[PDB]
Amino acid sequence: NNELSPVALRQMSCAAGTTQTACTDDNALAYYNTTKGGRFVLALLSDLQDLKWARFPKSDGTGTIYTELEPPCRFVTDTPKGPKVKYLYFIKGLNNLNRGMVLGSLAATVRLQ
Amino acid sequence: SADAQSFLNRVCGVSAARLTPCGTGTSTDVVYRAFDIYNDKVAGFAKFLKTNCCRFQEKDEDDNLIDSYFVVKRHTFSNYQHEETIYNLLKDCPAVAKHDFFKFRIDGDMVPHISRQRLTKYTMADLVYALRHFDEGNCDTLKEILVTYNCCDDDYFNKKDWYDFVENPDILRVYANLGERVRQALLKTVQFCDAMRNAGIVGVLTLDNQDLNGNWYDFGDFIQTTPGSGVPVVDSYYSLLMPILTLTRALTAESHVDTDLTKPYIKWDLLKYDFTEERLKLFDRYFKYWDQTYHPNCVNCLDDRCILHCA
Amino acid sequence: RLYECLYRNRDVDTDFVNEFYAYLRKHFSMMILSDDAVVCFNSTYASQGLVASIKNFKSVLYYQNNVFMSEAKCWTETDLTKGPHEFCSQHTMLVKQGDDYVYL
Amino acid sequence: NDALNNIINNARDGCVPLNIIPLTTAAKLMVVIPDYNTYKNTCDGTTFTY
Ligand SMILES: Nc1nc2c(ncn2[C@@H]2O[C@H](COP(=O)(O)OP(=O)(O)NP(=O)(O)O)[C@@H](O)[C@H]2O)c(=O)[nH]1
Ligand SMILES: *P(=O)(O)OC[C@H]1O[C@@](C#N)(c2ccc3c(N)ncnn23)[C@H](O)[C@@H]1O
């Protein structure tokens, strides 16, 4: 056996934007994993079409993290809402293993057709 | 001869069929082989014991045995459908071995089987393990690999000190006879990654799922995305194999006119020293899905970890 | 954790480096001059394959140094009251000096 | 000499490798031969090409 994600990951709320100041309000579904100091989020997903800036403050409250996003990827899934035409975005520079775990858990327990 | 011979006739399918049970009747065959493992219980690159296949060797004309095998797995029913789905998604790549799904009655139940056709006795993991854990009193796998692919013959292992690098530096000439096999394996790996990206398949590539001809199998840990978004993970494959590319001198064919070993060497300009574009072409041809940035000139690196990586 | 710090994690993990360093310092102690060495190691761990033996050095040198190390130029000592068989061209002796015993 | 300027002006940016200057501009060659078998295959006769 050689596997992708033995144990899974999580997600809390998040905000994003397009321009430098479009960092307005809670706008994504950003997954994350726990690091010893500072927690790194993996995948940005919501009903966003062209968004470049995904934002959240510093643990100190002093700064606020800045992120640039990639080009989009298509997918439509199943829910009692029905076909959710979404776009999920990966932060800049996400390597292949992290995308692998994200897509793994998502397509595993989050519907998709 | 209605349960050992009926099985042997169903395994042949519609291809050439001169097989022989490399074992006993319709029970399995156990062997000691090298694997690259990672689940939530165990990890490592070690030698384990395989226990769930029945292997048949193909005969040639004159009834001479050749290096082509049929490996018939046996397992549960959900893995069967999952593997069939993924295989039918990927079945048109030339770098994928040919599969065959069927059901058969063992005693009173219909058990599902998966057959893999014209495999090789050893994988790439066996070669890498043989060369990275060398012991001169226990090296039967290495000798068998060397003899099978016509690098040397069985009398080469009598002029003892045959393995030493300082005494008998002729062993480099023998190791360099395995190089074109390794180069062909690399090219097929890139093909397979492209197919995976197009179909929408996600999974990690390991050395024990490729035979010594270059073909791939075992899609049991692979999942599905939407087409155009597949992700191959290649980080232990390439780096575990890295020391073997300079020992076998795999990239030698790139000094010839058309990457053809039967042709003259390339004639270069005598005042040329840059070669930056050629390095990028080589990197794109053999390591297309290695996802860390490569700087041909190390004056543009970010720290000393980057310098090590790119050098 | 060693597997997933080699082939799955992409940056440095400081806690596990500290942990592995402590493990090595406890079960594998080294005295190093410029390419000479003496090691004191745990025997029970080495017989189960949890720390390096003399064969692991042979394999590592074969694939990372392009040399063959013969086991007729290595040594081992199972009694600690006679020190290293050799270090910087010196032998060792446990002699009585005054009131106690010292190594010369 | 003029051989030096000839190869230097054929370079696109002015730079050349140092290993090709004696190989292309030197006037005199020296060969060191270990045994007769090597002599037969390298410089037998009174003119050879290298
Ligand atoms: N190429 C090859 N490998 C063989 C043969 N017989 C045994 N093996 C070994 O058995 C392995 C095949 O195992 P298999 O049951 O197909 O599953 P797997 O390779 O572990 N991949 P998975 O992670 O999906 O289980 C090879 O990697 C190799 O180590 C043979 O005839 N040919
Ligand atoms: P995987 O590639 O699916 O199987 C490779 C090979 O390794 C085993 C052997 N035996 C093995 C050893 C230990 C474990 C664990 N903990 N989990 C799953 N598999 N193994 C397998 O039997 C298999 O043959």
Ligand SMILES: [Mg+2]
């Ligand atoms: Mg299996």
Ligand SMILES: [Zn+2]
């Ligand atoms: Zn670099």
